[PDB]
Amino acid sequence: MNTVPFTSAPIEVTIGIDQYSFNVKENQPFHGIKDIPIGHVHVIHFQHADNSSMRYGYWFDCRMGNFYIQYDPKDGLYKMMEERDGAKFENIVHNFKERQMMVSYPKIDEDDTWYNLTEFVQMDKIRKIVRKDENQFSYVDSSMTTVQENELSDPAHSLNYTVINFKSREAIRPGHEMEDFLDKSYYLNTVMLQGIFKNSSNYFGELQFAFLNAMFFGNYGSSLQWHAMIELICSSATVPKHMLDKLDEILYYQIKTLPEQYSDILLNERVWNICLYSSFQKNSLHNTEKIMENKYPELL
Amino acid sequence: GAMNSSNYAELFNNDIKLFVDDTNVYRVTVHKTFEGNVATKAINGCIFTLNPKTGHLFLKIIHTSVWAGQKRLSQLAKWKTAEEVSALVRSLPKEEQPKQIIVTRKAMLDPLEVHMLDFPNIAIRPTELRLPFSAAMSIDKLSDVVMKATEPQMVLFNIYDDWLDRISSYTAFSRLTLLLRALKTNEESAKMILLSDPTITIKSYHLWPSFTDEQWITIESQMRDLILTEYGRKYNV
Ligand SMILES: O=C(c1cccs1)N(CCO)C1CC1
Numbered sequence: 001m002n003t004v005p006f007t008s009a010p011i012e013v014t015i016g017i018d019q020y021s022f023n024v025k026e027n028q029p030f031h032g033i034k035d036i037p038i039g040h041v042h043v044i045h046f047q048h049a050d051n052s053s054m055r056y057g058y059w060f061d062c063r064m065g066n067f068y069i070q071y072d073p074k075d076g077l078y079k080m081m082e083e084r085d086g087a088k089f090e091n092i093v094h095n096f097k098e099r100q101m102m103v104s105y106p107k108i109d110e111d112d113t114w115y116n117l118t119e120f121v122q123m124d125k126i127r128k129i130v131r132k133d134e135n136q137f138s139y140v141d142s143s144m145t146t147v148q149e150n151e152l153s154d155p156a157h158s159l160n161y162t163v164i165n166f167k168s169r170e171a172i173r174p175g176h177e178m179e180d181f182l183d184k185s186y187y188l189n190t191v192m193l194q195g196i197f198k199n200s201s202n203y204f205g206e207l208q209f210a211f212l213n214a215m216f217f218g219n220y221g222s223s224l225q226w227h228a229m230i231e232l233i234c235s236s237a238t239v240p241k242h243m244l245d246k247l248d249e250i251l252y253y254q255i256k257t258l259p260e261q262y263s264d265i266l267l268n269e270r271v272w273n274i275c276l277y278s279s280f281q282k283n284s285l286h287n288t289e290k291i292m293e294n295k296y297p298e299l300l
Numbered sequence: 301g302a303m304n305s306s307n308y309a310e311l312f313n314n315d316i317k318l319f320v321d322d323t324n325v326y327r328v329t330v331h332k333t334f335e336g337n338v339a340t341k342a343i344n345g346c347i348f349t350l351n352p353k354t355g356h357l358f359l360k361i362i363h364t365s366v367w368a369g370q371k372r373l374s375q376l377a378k379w380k381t382a383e384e385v386s387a388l389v390r391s392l393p394k395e396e397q398p399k400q401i402i403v404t405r406k407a408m409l410d411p412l413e414v415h416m417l418d419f420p421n422i423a424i425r426p427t428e429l430r431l432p433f434s435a436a437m438s439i440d441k442l443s444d445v446v447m448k449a450t451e452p453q454m455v456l457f458n459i460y461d462d463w464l465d466r467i468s469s470y471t472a473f474s475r476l477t478l479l480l481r482a483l484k485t486n487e488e489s490a491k492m493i494l495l496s497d498p499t500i501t502i503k504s505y506h507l508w509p510s511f512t513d514e515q516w517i518t519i520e521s522q523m524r525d526l527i528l529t530e531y532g533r534k535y536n537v
């Protein structure tokens with residue numbers, strides 16, 4: 001169980017850690033988050049009280065270094081940093097724990113939610129989507145655009161998700177125009193799985209990461225990417241059975257966790273109605289279709 | 301964007317463009333089987349691909365053999381149309397290729413777009429008008445070559461005959477659309493108007509009769525009446 005200490009909390013802010021969040025008042029004696037479960041990536045995220053605009057945060061894995069948060073009054077945000085002096089870090093954390101100035105990661109023992117949302121997500125792959133190689137952690141915020149979004153403007157600050165485009169030469173083999181457009185199995189299995197992602201685990205990891213950035217930061221290009229990756233599977237007549245079963249579990253837990261009051265902006269009516277009721281896989285997502293019908297029957 | 305009344309003169313500028321109409325590609329007669337069920341029998345069809353500035357009509361005849369053993373024919377028909385249009389474009393010299401293709405039905409947009417991926421600088425556009433190009437099979441010489449075909453075939457026509465020697469493209473297209481509206485609205489009466497006078501003939505190399513300028517004004521007036529009456533008489537007025 002690892003710790004992310006905070007130097008201080010000089011501005012009032014709602015701090016999230018994975019699916020949890022808490023309010024910190026201006027100059028309250030808050031010095032971080034302890035008992036963070038080892039074995040998963042995590043995200044620590046921020047919404048200032050004054051400017052609910054710009055949610056931002058950091059993806060990190062405590063196995064990869066000792067990380068802390070420190071407010072920068074010039075750039076006006078809480079920054080993640082790595083501490084290379086390991087004894088200095090342990091000494092800081094031990095003192096803050098002794099003075100009980102840290103909140104505890106509040107995981108219920110039965111609760112597998114975070115594992116289920118991050119099962120295939122790996123820091124190494126996050127760091128290729130979010131390019132900033134001098135840091136072991138990755139910054140994301142509400143405004144960052146995706147590479148595909150930029151083709152339709154600062155390249156360094158982009159989300160380099162895999163470009164999916166159903167009306168593209170990559171998607172459509174010469175001579176198979178109708179076949180490949182109506183049944184995307186070629187594009188899913190050969191171009192994307194065999195060619196680009198190498199296996200279904202990396203595909204799922206990018207799909208899960210896209211969802212999480214959509215949910216936690218309201219990142220619109222991430223939401224587009226999540227729905228595109230869902231639609232590509234559902235619109236393929238030929239998908240390995242293990243992938244369909246896993247997708248149903250993945251989406252089930254995403255829909256379960258989504259705040260009910262954000263469903264109007266975060267769920268695309270067309271993709272979901274197509275996937276659940278018209279696509280090749282309309283009968284292959286039993287858990288997802290049941291939670292969608294009981295939680296968001298309006299959308300459908 | 302979409303082609304509509306507001307940008308109508310764009311049809312007659314100097315950017316090459318084609319209309320594509322797929323209405324008559326997949327054509328069937330519906331009939332009873334011996335067991336009392338219903339079945340279709342396909343008949344020959346055509347793609348109607350028209351340059352509105354020059355009158356050049358690329359009439360690709362769709363022979364019934366192309367449907368043999370295929371499923372979801374109304375869907376296939378749209379993709380076949382897009383395949384043939386794409387093949388036509390690739391057959392033309394670069395300087396004759398269109399800069400825009402306007403489809404008369406929105407369901408043709410994705411099939412054509414996918415088939416034209418090799419041509420990113422050709423705009424594929426819908427139209428908001430309900431253009432009456434389906435009535436092309438009421439033109440006797442067009443219907444005749446389609447029904448006689450025994451194999452796939454492309455036949456080239458100028459749908460304006462020699463009109464462009466005396467009128468502008470804008471006027472020629474307007475006359476064509478009016479004639480097609482007449483033929484669509486009431487085919488028999490429309491055809492009566494056009495052939496009633498035995499002294500006005502259709503030249504061997506033309507589709508329509510050789511009306512003088514004055515006779516065309518009379519003819520066009522008669523087509524407006526027939527269409528006006530029927531629009532009145534159909535909305536019962
Ligand atoms: O008759 C028309 C009308 C125009 C304006 C009112 S009716 N046609 C065919 C021309 O003969 C076309 C819109 C111009």
Ligand SMILES: O=C(c1cccs1)N(CCO)C1CC1
Nearest residue numbers: 430485527528530531532534
């Ligand atoms: O039945 C007609 C017409 C009748 C007479 C002139 S137009 N329409 C035109 C729409 O108003 C139908 C849409 C095809």
